[PDB]
Amino acid sequence: HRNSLIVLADVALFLALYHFLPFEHNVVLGISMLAFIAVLWLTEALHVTVTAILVPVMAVFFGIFETQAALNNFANSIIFLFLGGFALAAAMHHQGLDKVIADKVLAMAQGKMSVAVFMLFGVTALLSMWISNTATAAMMLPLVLGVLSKVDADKQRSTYVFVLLGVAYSASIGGIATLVGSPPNAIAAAEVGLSFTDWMKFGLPTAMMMLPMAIAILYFLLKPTLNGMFELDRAPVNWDKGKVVTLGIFGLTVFLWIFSSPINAALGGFKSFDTLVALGAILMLSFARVVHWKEIQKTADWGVLLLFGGGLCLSNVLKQTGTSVFLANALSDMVSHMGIFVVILVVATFVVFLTEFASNTASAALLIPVFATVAEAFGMSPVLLSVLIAVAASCAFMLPVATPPNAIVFASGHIKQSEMMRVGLYLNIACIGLLTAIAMLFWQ
């Protein structure tokens, strides 16, 4: 098979780099490993999580760490803060609080495709802030195909592709608003030690800008939906048992997540307060009987939770072997010749296009450690590159295979490959600007 070969080709690459690199053994090991993992995660010949589990089992056998010390990465507070976000999402889906949020808002538009689709995007993004990205897409597709049936003429495609590609992007832009939403955010927060409200100060404003900037680009390429009528055909929804409760807990949780800084300070200064709140939410939702555990076990992506640990293990493997400082020495002249504009532009550009070929999180899982630790060897705060890398990681807008949401609206069997491949090629450039713009603004 292909992937069995990519692994074999990668295994050879490691053995080659291992015996032939002419540096201090620690650097040779860290270099060989970083290459090995980079392939397995970008090619994905092996499952992201399988590669994640491979990270510790390597460091342990090659004397970098001891077994228990390596595994301890998989229990970082962010993992549980993310697992708390999973149970918080699983709750309002099994409860239907996502459905009622779509109807009550989508019915606010009386019957206009103009104010409908503009409401479909705002809801898809708002829902990605807390639930997910791949999950929010599948939940929206039937609601879009339902609306896009009055103008059911396929020969009227562009009226019916603008709404499909629009939500698939709003789900990705929504995941850039909060620490929960896309693993990349958690990978950055866990790498540089970000709080929920810390990452929101970065991503949310960026998403505020990217959503209009993204619709404008979608609008002014082939919008033909001004006229149209609504066919809300199905049983309406209605606030049932504790859908207000889930909203209350949710709102309460997000209130503590936002006001965690003063709440925690005016409480004794606990360590991972946001992680506790995420764990506290898991409790309230269970005491309030609103969600069973079987639900969370399905919704939770334990592979990403395992990936989180694998990514932190890598970050620590780069340091212990000095590969973080060795690469900073290697880039000394190169990076001194470059400006930080070129850097954040090269990085942003590199990822915003790199994420088109590989998984969103699999890209951050590899670059967030390298750039953060190398930025550290340079004595630079790994926050900027990490948040930057983590944000541009969720900027997959060209071909599918970049993000599941892309392949979700593509399986609708209507939007042409070429159609998507070129809207993202424009949006990618748009973000490289906005990001480098915002990345420059978020400086002083």
Binding residues for fumarate: 133-134, 182, 360-361
Least separation in angstroms between residue 128's CB and ligand FUM is 8
| H-run or E-run covering 33 | helix 25-42
Cβ 440 vs Cβ 341: under 8 Å: yes
Residue 406 CB neighbours (<10 A): 24
Residue 1: name its binding partner from Na ion, ligand FUM, a copy of itself, none (Cβ under 5 to 8 Å by kind): a copy of itself
Which x/- pattern, by CB under 6 A, does the window 313-352 give for ligand FUM? ----------------------------------------
Residues 6+ positions from 223 with CB-CB distance below 8 Å: 158, 162
User: Could you tell me how many residues of this chain bind ligand FUM (CB under 6 A)?
Assistant: 10
Residue 43: name its binding partner from ligand FUM, Na ion, a copy of itself, none (Cβ under 5 to 8 Å by kind): none
Q: Give the CA radius of gyration of the chain.
A: 22
CA 411 to CA 7: how far, in whole Å? 29
Q: Closest by alpha carbon to 171, among 129, 221, 143?
A: 129
Residue 128: name its binding partner from a copy of itself, Na ion, ligand FUM, none (Cβ under 5 to 8 Å by kind): Na ion
Q: Which two tokens stand for residue 283?
A: 């409790």
The 3-class secondary structure across 237-273, one letter per residue, is CCCCCCHHHHHHHHHHHHHHHHCHHHHHHCCCCCCCH
Residues 6+ positions from 383 with CB-CB distance below 8 Å: 188, 192, 194
Residue 67: name its binding partner from ligand FUM, a copy of itself, Na ion, none (Cβ under 5 to 8 Å by kind): a copy of itself
Residues 6+ positions from 220 with CB-CB distance below 8 Å: none
CA 290 to CA 6: how far, in whole Å? 46
Site residues (CB under 6 A) for ligand FUM, limited to 164-203 = 182-183
Least separation in angstroms between residue 211's CB and ligand FUM is 16
What DSSP state is assigned to residue 359?
-
Residue 387 CB neighbours (<10 A): 28
Q: Give exposure, 292-331, as e/b (b: 16+ Cβ within 10 Å).
A: eeebbeebbbebbbbbbbbbbbbbbbbbebbbbbbbbeeb
Residues 6+ positions from 126 with CB-CB distance below 8 Å: 101, 174
Distance in angstroms between the alpha carbons of the first and the last residue of the chain? 51
Least separation in angstroms between residue 366's CB and a copy of itself is 18
What DSSP state is assigned to residue 1?
-
Q: Which is nearer to a copy of itself, 47 or 223 (CB)?
A: 47
Exactly one of 225, 246, 323, 360 binds Na ion (CB under 5 A); which one? 360
- Is there binding between residue 75 and a copy of itself (CB under 8 A)? yes
Exactly one of 309, 311, 322, 404 binds a copy of itself (CB under 8 A); which one? 309
Q: Which stretch in 93-101, 123-131, 162-170, 341-349 sits in contact with Na ion by CB under 5 A?
A: 123-131
Instruction: Tell me the residue number closest to ligand FUM, measured at CB.
Output: 360
Site residues (CB under 6 A) for ligand FUM, limited to 103-162 = 132-134
Cβ 369 vs Cβ 314: under 8 Å: yes
Q: Which stretch in 12-20, 48-56, 102-110, 201-209 sits in contact with a copy of itself by CB under 8 A?
A: 48-56
Cβ 217 vs Cβ 423: under 8 Å: yes
Q: By CB neighbour count within 10 A (0-12 exposed, 13-18 middle, 19+ buried), where does 96 fall?
A: middle
- Is there binding between residue 307 and a copy of itself (CB under 8 A)? no
Residue 20: name its binding partner from a copy of itself, ligand FUM, Na ion, none (Cβ under 5 to 8 Å by kind): none
Q: Which stretch in 218-226, 265-273, 341-349, 359-367 sits in contact with ligand FUM by CB under 6 A?
A: 359-367
Least separation in angstroms between residue 325's CB and Na ion is 29
* Type of residue at 390: A
Q: Which stretch in 17-25, 66-74, 351-359, 418-426 sits in contact with a copy of itself by CB under 8 A?
A: 66-74
Least separation in angstroms between residue 8's CB and a copy of itself is 9
| H-run or E-run covering 342 | helix 340-354
Q: Which is nearer to Na ion, 136 or 159 (CB)?
A: 136
Which x/- pattern, by CB under 8 A, does the window 274-293 give for a copy of itself? -xx--xx-xx--xx-x--xx
Q: Closest by alpha carbon to 177, among 247, 254, 95?
A: 254
Which x/- pattern, by CB under 5 A, does the window 147-186 give for Na ion? ----------------------------x-----xx----
Residues at the site binding a copy of itself, with contacts judged by CB under 8 A:
1, 4, 7, 46-47, 49-50, 53-54, 56-57, 60-61, 66-68, 71-77, 80, 270-273, 275-276, 279-280, 282-283, 286-287, 289, 292-293, 297, 300, 302-303, 309
Residues at the site binding ligand FUM, with contacts judged by CB under 6 A:
132-134, 182-183, 359-361, 403-404
Residues at the site binding Na ion, with contacts judged by CB under 5 A:
128, 132-133, 175, 181-182, 355, 359-360, 396, 402
